[PDB]
Design a protein around this ligand. Structure first.
Ligand code: LI1
Ligand code: LI1
Ligand code: LI1
Ligand code: LI1
Ligand code: LI1
Ligand code: LI1
Ligand code: LI1
Ligand code: LI1
Ligand code: LI1
Ligand code: LI1
Ligand code: LI1
Ligand code: SQU
Ligand code: SQU
Ligand code: SQU
Ligand code: RET
Ligand code: RET
Ligand code: RET
Lengths: 222, 222, 222
């Protein structure tokens, strides 16, 4: 449309749709209960992202937020996506290493706090307070990354695949607070069209790339 | 009140309230942990529906949505109901057959996508896009119905009761997208008062009727 | 600020932040999976409350609701807090006694209904209907308290700690509907600044006080 960022919302919609259908077909037949869990979790992630990219593409998941005396276009649908897809991504990691339930609830709850405070930050109309919420969300993110590294006798197959996905997760997820800080939600240094491109590449990599690595590994089977 | 549909919201409120109290009393005493699960799940469903019917009856769960150049009365509280009650109904089915956790997460997540895209469709102000969301929600519904039929050594008691509830579920749930399509959320072929009657009969049947069948079966006991 | 109640939102923010960091540090090292669960649950509660107190303090979690012909300041962020923190508090109790899953789902679902109908009551613009929602929420609360007392061979260590936390829970949680009834959400007998003080003392006691009792007990270890 008239929104220059439309092309990246359209490409992200397509890519998440295609990833969803690929993983759907791929998991057809799988009978191992353990593998079944990883396919469900991992197919659901880009399915949810597909709907929220389409909602941005059609204009539904966009609102205007007054701050710095302007009307700032804020895509809130990203936070409805991430609210469900980032704990699912963490559950994939957690199941892979057989984490303790206490550790899984710490991770999902820290993740809820990360996304919910990012959403409050995104909708806050007092510009300086936006970055108070950024900082608290960043601190929740660093707790999560801490736990993925210092909280975890795996069969060597598990260990290997987990190490790769853990490194993929730390590098990609750490970029999100930087994009938000420099982008239209934060300091406004990078235009919305380039921010939207950055988040499209991260999201597709963190969902479809991550899941291609995982669903190719024998680590997901008993 | 002045809303002609008030009578059906009032009758649905009453019927869900009465079903809730019936199942509450009925489960009193039950000590079998397995049965306890089915009573909790099955009592909670019409309890939640009671609150959301009452919220429609009092006007709280109604909003106006501009589309086709008019101010369309949209009862959004139905989606807050269904968001929680339809996965609970699916958990009742899933526990009955002892489904794999992977299969249960596929079902709840597809259900979330069904209701959340129905809600976006219900609130979308570009009329043609309303039916894009309908189609995606319908596709999620057909995945769910697919899985209830082709994804599942039960004791014969389980099998029998599950087959009846599965057929009840396919027939009733399949009517919802048709009512939405022809009703005030969609093409506007059927007036809101008759739509509200249709959804009242479906909801009471899918909640209180379904639960009367289930909570009468010995299938829920170890 | 100019809101007289600011001081109690500031003190509650501080106290929940300090409790969160205390329990975070305290649980460092714990390796017992059972204890790990109680630390996760119990650290998350004041972490979530911290964010929602800060959101009230900065003005984000406050809205104006017209009722009784005025513009009533309603802090809705309390309900986003309680939606997650009160089932977590109930899970702490439930895990302590090894409750049946049926019993845990009854408790979380009744809790959802308690907070969600309190939120509808808080935002309802027809003054008399506000108290219809209060009554239904109160009835959900009495079901929960009923179950904590008449629904539950514990090692004596569990029993002892559970009895203390159960009495703490009945006394503190029972005060919330009274504060709401006499406060700005209800009859408006007590000013918002004193209501906000009452809820700060209850919340800190029900979260940080409760958790100090629990995380000091050996009951949380296998
Ligand atoms: C757990 C564990 C831990 C909990 C984390 C603690 C932090 C909780 C914060 C959360 C609070 C939510 C705030 C939000 C609902 C309030 C919206 O009001 C806005 C601010 O003026 C209005 O903007 C205009 C509109 C805005 C749009 C916001 C909508 C978003 C919707 C995302 C939710 C999705 C759920 C799918 C529903 C179907
Ligand atoms: C920070 C602590 C660790 C955590 C405590 C929470 C406080 C978070 C805020 C930190 C910082 C003050 C925020 C204040 C930004 C300030 C420069 C605003 C600039 O002033 C202008 C008018 O006053 C704002 O208009 C518009 C000007 C804008 C274009 C300026 C953008 C502001 C930028 C803020 C960037 C924050 C990061 C650098 C944090 C990295 C650590
Ligand atoms: C570091 C830790 C908490 C930092 C304490 C700061 C104290 C600020 O006091 C006044 C400074 O003018 C704020 O009042 C001025 C009015 C405004 C009030 C701001 C107070 C809050 C914004 C700070 C509450 C804690 C913060 C948390 C920063 C994120 C954390 C996760 C790193
Ligand atoms: C966005 C990309 C970084 C673009 C820059 C290109 C850099 C190349 C990839 C980044 C890094 C790659 C990590 C390799 C991994 C290998 C480590 O395996 C170790 C052996 O068990 C695990 O222990 C310990 C594991 C340790 C590994 C942690 C990786 C680091 C995390 C970097 C943070 C992120 C990038 C910061 C965002 C930036 C874009 C603002
Ligand atoms: C999971 C697994 C899978 C997730 C599924 C993917 C699809 C996610 C979509 C969801 C997004 C939610 C959208 C909604 C919150 C945004 C509301 O803004 C409206 C649109 O202009 C404003 O209408 C005016 C008001 C409207 C009213 C909407 C309110 C509704 C509330 C229902 C939620 C309930 C939660 C109980 C809370 C107590
Ligand atoms: C069938 C599958 C996806 C269908 C692809 C279609 C392609 C439409 O391209 C243009 C036709 O004018 C839409 O741009 C015109 C502007 C508008 C853009 C509409 C594109 C989206 C509405 C379609 C995205 C996928 C759809 C999913 C339909 C539901 C699915 C679950 C059956
Ligand atoms: C809303 C009602 C249909 C009103 C119309 C009256 C029709 C009578 C009931 C509908 C049907 C009844 C199904 C009977 C069942 C018996 C099948 O058991 C089989 C043996 O294991 C199960 O295998 C395979 C099971 C197969 C059974 C699937 C049932 C069919 C599903 C029909 C879709 C729904 C109706 C479409 C909605 C319409 C109202 C627009
Ligand atoms: C389960 C099991 C059981 C379910 C219980 C049954 C009762 C369900 C009721 C719920 C319905 C939610 C209503 C609400 C979303 C509708 C908001 O519209 C308001 C009323 O005019 C507008 O006020 C203006 C704004 C208001 C602010 C409301 C926002 C609140 C947000 C709290 C949710 C949090 C989620 C964290 C998200 C990140
Ligand atoms: C109640 C049943 C058990 C459950 C069924 C649900 C019905 C709930 C409502 C019960 C009660 C009628 C509500 C009516 C309050 C009524 C006195 C309102 C006062 O009239 C004034 C103008 O008409 C209201 O303006 C302003 C005047 C205000 C300052 C008056 C405040 C009203 C108070 C209501 C208090 C309710 C409790 C006493 C319930 C304790 C049991
Ligand atoms: C006690 C139980 C249910 C009580 C039934 C009452 C019947 C009220 O009928 C009319 C009285 O004028 C209400 O219509 C007047 C228009 C208004 C309609 C109000 C009807 C609803 C407010 C009552 C629905 C049930 C209530 C539940 C009260 C809370 C319960 C949990 C104790
Ligand atoms: C807000 C406070 C009450 C302020 C008033 C000061 C009163 C002192 C504390 C209240 C009470 C203390 C309860 C002691 C406990 C001991 C009971 O242990 C029993 C032995 O197993 C448990 O069986 C059965 C256990 C039984 C115990 C239930 C306690 C009672 C619950 C009281 C309801 C609350 C207060 C009503 C709210 C009021 C503030 C409007
Ligand atoms: C059969 C396999 C390999 C998958 C192909 C199905 C299509 C869907 C997406 C899968 C590919 C993505 C790999 C993740 C990595 C990336 C960094 C994603 C960033 C996207 C940018 C565009 C580059 C090309 C693509 C259009 C595939
Ligand atoms: C003891 C048993 C049988 C239950 C009676 C308690 C009351 C609550 C509801 C239970 C009855 C409903 C059966 C479900 C089937 C239907 C198709 C429901 C559609 C409702 C339409 C009105 C018909 C009559 C009723 C008011 C019972
Ligand atoms: C090391 C221990 C004891 C904890 C201290 C860390 C600080 C955070 C909060 C812990 C203290 C609270 C106990 C709960 C009981 C109360 C009734 C809370 C009501 C608060 C009112 C103010 C009273 C003093 C306080 C500022 C500690
Ligand atoms: C599928 C998409 C994924 C994996 C997205 C991850 C998003 C985050 C890690 C977001 C982090 C943020 C912060 C740490 C700071 C505040 C802003 C956020 C929400 C962008
Ligand atoms: C308790 C009520 C139940 C069982 C309701 C079920 C609702 C559905 C199956 C709704 C389905 C819909 C679609 C498939 C298309 C879009 C509109 C919906 C949400 C009505
Ligand atoms: C961390 C805070 C806790 C433990 C808060 C508990 C809140 C309740 C028990 C609230 C109860 C309410 C009712 C019973 C009636 C309606 C109003 C409420 C939501 C305040």
């Amino acid at each position: 449309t008239g929104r220059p960022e439309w092309i990246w919302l359209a490409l992200g919609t397509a890519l998440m749709g295609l990833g969803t259908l690929y993983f759907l077909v791929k998991g057809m037949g799988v009978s191992d209960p353990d593998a079944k869990k990883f396919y469900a979790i991992t197919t659901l992630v880009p399915a949810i992202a597909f709907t929220m990219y389409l909602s941005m593409l059609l204009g539904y998941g966009l609102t205007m937020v007054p701050f710095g005396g302007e009307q700032n276009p804020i895509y809130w649908a990203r936070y409805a996506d991430w609210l469900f897809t980032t704990p699912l991504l963490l559950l994939d990691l957690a199941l892979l290493v057989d984490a303790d339930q206490g550790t899984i609830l710490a991770l999902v709850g820290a993740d809820g706090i990360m996304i919910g405070t990012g959403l409050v930050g995104a909708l806050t109309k007092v510009y300086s307070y936006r970055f108070v919420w950024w900082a608290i969300s960043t601190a929740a993110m660093l707790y999560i990354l801490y736990v993925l590294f210092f909280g975890f006798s795996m069969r060597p197959e598990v260990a290997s695949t987990f190490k790769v996905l853990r490194n993929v997760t730390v590098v990609l997820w750490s970029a999100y607070p930087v994009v938000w800080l420099i982008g239209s939600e934060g300091a406004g240094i990078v235009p919305l069209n380039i921010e939207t491109l950055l988040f499209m590449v991260l999201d597709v990599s963190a969902k479809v790339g991550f899941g291609l690595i995982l669903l190719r590994s024998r680590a997901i089977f008993g």
